[PDB]
Design a protein around this ligand. Structure first.
Ligand code: SF4
Ligand code: NI
Ligand code: NI
Length: 729
């Protein structure tokens, strides 16, 4: 029902087909299929029809075939019918559809030729040697293709052929790897880059697959994503094509002299929705308007690819003493190696983002008031304050908090920087090697300016940074930052589910939980715990086309359970028609689904007439007879699970917390540490609900027991209200 081919309509005017390209693709597809046929015939003559065939370290047989038509190739005989079908779909009528079919058949033939090549592979005598990868194993696909489909990797570049010269290859490839794109390299371009001393490999997500049919090892890798994270069934061809077009932002760079087989493989990439850009000049009758295009100028080539693919690159190269990269963010200056820590010892510290007018401040201002880092011996400590001023043609005060949390990430983006927490509690810290390598505060303010200009092109125009280090001035501005925090917290305090007419979807976790849809409301945070209603609203207003969308409350169904037709229909359209109803205020009937990053899991226990809760960090056994990870396997994945629900921790303190199930009064068990961490909001909420300030003492924890038999006598002795409430069954 997908009708994927819609996407190609209008690429070609009627009667104006690029017939030379289609003739080349047809000859190349017949050639590749003939190669595969005769090679399979000789393999069967040599080993027998029932001989095993396959790739190392994969659960998906021949993944391209397994996805597009579903066969689980395991022996040579299995390939025989497939090739027949492929030959039948290579048709001589010179249409764009027949060209796409011929490209699909070329992918099938290359996949078969590669598996036949692996007939001689053993771990003791590999056919793959460094630096080439050949077929890439499933574990690499898990680890990096999850980032490929959530778009933390901006895109993928499939480069076949050669660049005009080795330095031009190094130029475009250093450009692409510096913009973070994953690279699949096939043929002589590998040797070009290697003589230019470019590092390459799986650790750099630059895979030198090999030559000729090895290009298919990009395709199967891509298609395994759809088999693996998308959950699409084997043989659902158009569903896999749509998933590739939608999630895998890949394109082909077809460099060097054309040959018919490479062109047929590029047409197969077009068949699954990947545009091809070539450096060769093309006549009009050998090109397609948005799919097979010439960009001879190398200075532009990369740009054109991204523009045709819809990729939007954030990154910008910048002149810094210190190398900047995300991978450092796990670094820590443990107490043996602390250099110049700020904050947390009651040493003053603060951070703030603030909107401003246009003509009272200038772009690029970067000031470091007071002492720099030069003023201390190792092991020292100074007070620090920050100001990041922003003007934008579209900027709003609403965006200010959403940017502040980013400075956290920004500061850990380079070596020797370490920031945890936020606002007045900004535990800023510096490493000794960084001030050994000569980095100072001015470069860090430049780093914040550069990242703010990179990540928000639509909204920020004229931004500047000013740091302060005086112990007295830092407090003078800490007070004003407190005033800003206070007006923001007051605006947050105003919000209730009833005070707003619109909730916000979150689809961010469909990268690994395709049927899951979050609905964020003012009194129910996203179950990851990191997306509030204000956050999803600002993310939509910044990026209207993004994964957070407004949903008006329309079509009321259940006033008490919290069901509306608008939320039902949005979830149904975005859950692949698997979820039809959702109740906001209960877990016992049509609960919201979960992905898998939930901070805690609730479960109803009829034996205790109430809810247990267990946070992700708790590793002990729970009264339901399972630990958190066992329950997580059953509660996540976008499936509706009445009696169970994933939640953020702060939701436990919401006034709306499972209000139709009895709310906080219904909670009978949670881990002791989670109870202590939430003790204040639990005490407040139980007080205003009439349960008493002491209600938290009635909640059982693991020190009372881990089974219902141990827990019930405690609940009876304490008079826990849930025992007098209606059973929820
Ligand atoms: S848990 Fe929900 S709100 Fe949080 S990122 Fe995932 S989909 Fe979005
Ligand atoms: Ni999740
Ligand atoms: Ni999630």
């Amino acid at each position: 029902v997908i009708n994927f081919d819609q996407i190609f309509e209008g690429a070609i005017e009627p009667g104006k087909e690029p017939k030379r390209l289609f003739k080349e693709v047809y000859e190349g597809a017949i050639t590749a299929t003939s190669y595969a046929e005769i090679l399979l015939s000789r393999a069967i003559e040599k080993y027998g029809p029932d001989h095993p065939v396959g790739y190392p370290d994969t659960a998906y047989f021949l993944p391209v075939i397994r996805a597009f038509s579903g066969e689980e190739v395991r022996t040579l005989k299995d390939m025989v019918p497939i090739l027949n079908r492929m030959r039948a779909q290579i048709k001589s009528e010179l249409t764009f559809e027949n060209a796409r079919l011929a490209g699909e058949a070329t992918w099938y033939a290359a996949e078969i030729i590669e598996a036949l090549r692996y007939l001689k592979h053993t771990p003791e005598n590999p056919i793959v040697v460094p630096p080439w990868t050949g077929f890439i194993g499933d574990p690499v696909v898990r680890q990096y293709g999850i980032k490929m489909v959530d778009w933390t990797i901006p895109g993928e570049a499939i480069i076949i052929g050669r660049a005009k010269d080795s330095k031009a290859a190094k130029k475009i490839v250093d450009d692409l790897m510096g913009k973070g794109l994953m690279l699949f390299l096939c043929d002589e371009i590998i040797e070009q880059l290697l003589e230019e001393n470019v590092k390459l490999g799986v650790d750099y997500i630059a895979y030198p697959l090999g030559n000729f049919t090895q290009v298919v090892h990009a395709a199967n890798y891509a298609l395994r994503a759809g088999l693996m994270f998308g959950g699409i069934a084997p043989g659902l061809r158009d569903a896999h094509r749509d998933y590739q077009r939608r999630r895998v932002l890949a394109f082909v760079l077809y460099l060097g002299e054309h040959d018919m087989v490479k062109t047929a493989a590029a047409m197969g990439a077009i068949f699954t929705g990947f545009p091809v850009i070539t450096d060769q000049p093309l006549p009009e009758d050998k090109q397609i308007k948005d799919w097979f295009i010439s960009e001879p100028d190398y200075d532009k080539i990369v740009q054109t690819a991204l523009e045709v693919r819809g990729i939007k690159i954030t990154s910008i190269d910048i002149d810094l003493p210190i190398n900047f990269g995300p991978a450092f963010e796990g670094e820590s200056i443990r107490k043996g190696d602390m250099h110049v820590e700020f904050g947390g010892g009651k040493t003053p510290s603060f951070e703030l983002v603030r909107m401003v007018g246009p003509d009272e401040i200038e772009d690029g201002k970067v000031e470091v008031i007071g002492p720099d880092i030069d003023s201390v011996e190792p092991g020292g400590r100074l007070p620090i304050g920050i100001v990041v001023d922003i003007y934008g043609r579209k900027m709003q005060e609403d965006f200010e908090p959403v940017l502040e949390r980013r400075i956290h990430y920004f500061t850990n983006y380079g070596e020797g920087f370490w920031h945890t927490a936020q606002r007045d509690l900004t535990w800023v810290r510096i490493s000794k090697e960084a001030f050994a390598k000569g980095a100072r505060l001015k470069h860090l303010g430049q780093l914040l300016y550069a990242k703010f200009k990179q990540e928000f092109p639509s909204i920020v125009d004229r931004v500047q940074v000013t740091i302060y280090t005086d112990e007295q001035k830092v407090l003078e501005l800490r007070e004003i930052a407190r005033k800003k925090y206070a007006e923001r917290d007051a605006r947050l305090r105003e919000l209730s589910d009833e005070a707003v007419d619109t909730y916000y979807s979150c689809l961010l976790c469909q990268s690994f939980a395709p049927t899951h849809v979050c609905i964020v409301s003012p009194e129910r945070v996203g179950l990851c715990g990191a997306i509030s209603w204000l956050d999803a609203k600002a993310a939509y207003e910044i990026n209207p086309n993004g994964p957070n969308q407004p949903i008006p409350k329309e079509g009321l169904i259940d006033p008490v359970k919290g069901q509306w037709e608008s939320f039902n229909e949005y979830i149904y359209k975005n859950s692949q028609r698997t979820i039809e109803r959702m109740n906001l205020y209960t877990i016992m009937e049509y609960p919201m689904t979960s992905c898998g990053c939930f901070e805690a899991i609730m479960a109803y226990l009829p034996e205790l007439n109430g809810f247990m809760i267990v946070n992700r960090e708790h590793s002990g056994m729970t009264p339901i007879g399972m630990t958190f990870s066992t329950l997580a396997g059953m509660v996540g994945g976008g499936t509706q699970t009445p009696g169970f629900m994933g939640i953020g921790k702060s939701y436990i303190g919401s006034r709306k917390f499972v209000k139709a199930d009895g709310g906080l009064a219904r909670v009978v068990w949670m881990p002791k540490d989670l109870k202590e961490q939430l003790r204040s909001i639990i005490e407040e909420r139980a007080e205003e609900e009439g349960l008493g300030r002491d209600f938290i003492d009635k909640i059982a924890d693991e020190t009372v027991g881990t089974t219902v038999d141990e827990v019930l006598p405690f609940l009876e002795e304490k008079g826990h209200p849930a025992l007098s409430m209606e059973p929820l069954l």
